[PDB]
Design a protein around this nucleic acid. Structure first.
Lengths: 180, 43, 47, 97
DNA sequence: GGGGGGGCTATAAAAGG
DNA sequence: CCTTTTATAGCCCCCCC
């Protein structure tokens, strides 16, 4: 296909390597939320790259929302620099992408009920519960959400190749169920 | 309808602290100075 | 001249993506130097 | 809520008190007691007295939430009250629950 | 009253009390 | 479990137009 899955979300983690005083961070940093009674971490956002971080008092952090590996690492570097500037000796240890989400359109309708009937060992489809068919691919280990509209979501990837590979695998299967 | 609320609040506060000033041994004149200082600062 | 400020209490603050909606009450505002008051204030802003 | 102390009303009060404290006419404790009385009075007057609605739109520059208190900063805002327009380049909003 | 806006449902993954 | 993110999409209820 001249069809290329576009990355939509990446979740990464990194270890700042030092304990953090979350109250201080919430009071001095901009665009921060801290409500320990409901969630133990500070929630901070930045506009470029547009992402949301979850910062724990342990010093570990989760970065979400970026659309590229480089944007994910950059964003996390910025969050770490903010914390750094507030006076904490933050490091940048073991950065790692944990999940990647892609999406695309095959440009044609799909016979979902047909697909689930013939691929009972990889998928499940309950229209009343969720309008999308869930396909658990084994290689690569990726989960796809397939809709009758032809729109496809791929998630569970650790690297970009798994996303592309999973879509190349599913495309011919989907063509086999196009809607006349 | 705003100057009204302010008068309203100043009056209530002044009336409500009179006894405290008295219990502290502060001359009621000081209380009136407070109200005056306060009202004029608004202007 | 003025530091435009609003001091109030919130009923509900909401966000979707970068869309925020504010449901405020009992507020005293000082805008452009003048003083205002509201029992309820509803606002919208993009972040 | 010691929320309404940094308002025109509340600040003029504190300034007046500081003078009296400065000229030793009242003690700090008494001043504190007066402010406490003010809190009850302004809060009570707002809820029972005022009763109008306002509307505003703008771009959110920053937000913060800690100790259950929201602090925003909007830019190019437009405060709308039936009788029209109030435009401001910047406004800071502090809100207690 | 209704619509539209919010929420629910489903998917992956990390953080740590 | 709490929470965040994001593509996708049907059905639910409710607010105040």
């Amino acid at each position: 296909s001249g069809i290329v899955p576009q990355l939509q979300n990446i979740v990464s983690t990194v270890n700042l390597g030092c304990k953090l005083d979350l109250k201080t961070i919430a009071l001095r940093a901009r665009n921060a939320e801290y409500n320990p009674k409901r969630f133990a971490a500070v929630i901070m956002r930045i506009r470029e790259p547009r992402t949301t971080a979850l910062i724990f008092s342990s010093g570990k952090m989760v970065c979400t929302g970026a659309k590229s590996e480089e944007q994910s690492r950059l964003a996390a570097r910025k969050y770490a620099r903010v914390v750094q500037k507030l006076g904490f000796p933050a490091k940048f240890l073991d950065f790692k992408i944990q999940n990647m989400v892609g999406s695309c359109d095959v440009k044609f309708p799909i016979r979902l009920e047909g697909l689930v009937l013939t691929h009972q060992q990889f998928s499940s489809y309950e229209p009343e519960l969720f309008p999308g068919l869930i396909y658990r691919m084994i290689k690569p280990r990726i989960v796809l959400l397939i809709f009758v509209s032809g729109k496809v979501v791929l998630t569970g990837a650790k690297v970009r190749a798994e996303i592309y590979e999973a879509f190349e695998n599913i495309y011919p299967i989907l063509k086999g169920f196009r809607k006349t | 309808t705003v100057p009204k609320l302010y008068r309203s609040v100043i009056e209530d506060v002044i009336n409500d602290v009179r006894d405290i000033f008295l219990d502290d041994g502060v001359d009621e004149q000081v209380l009136m100075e407070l109200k005056t200082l306060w009202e004029n600062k608004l202007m | 001249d003025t530091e435009n400020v609003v001091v109030c209490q919130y009923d509900k603050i909401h966000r979707s993506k970068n869309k925020w909606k504010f449901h405020l009450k009992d507020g005293i505002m000082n805008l452009n130097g003048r003083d205002y008051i509201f029992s309820k204030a509803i606002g919208d802003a993009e972040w | 809520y010691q929320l309404y102390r940094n308002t025109t009303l509340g600040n003029s009060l504190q300034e007046s008190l500081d003078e009296l404290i400065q000229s030793q006419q009242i003690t700090p404790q008494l001043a504190l007691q007066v402010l406490l009385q003010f809190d009850k009075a302004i809060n009570a007057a707002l809820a029972q007295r005022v009763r109008n609605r306002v509307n505003f739109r703008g771009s959110l520059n920053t937000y913060r939430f800690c100790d259950n208190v929201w602090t925003f900063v909007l830019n190019d805002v437009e405060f709308r009250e039936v009788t029209e327009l109030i435009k401001v380049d910047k406004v800071k909003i502090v809100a207690c629950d």
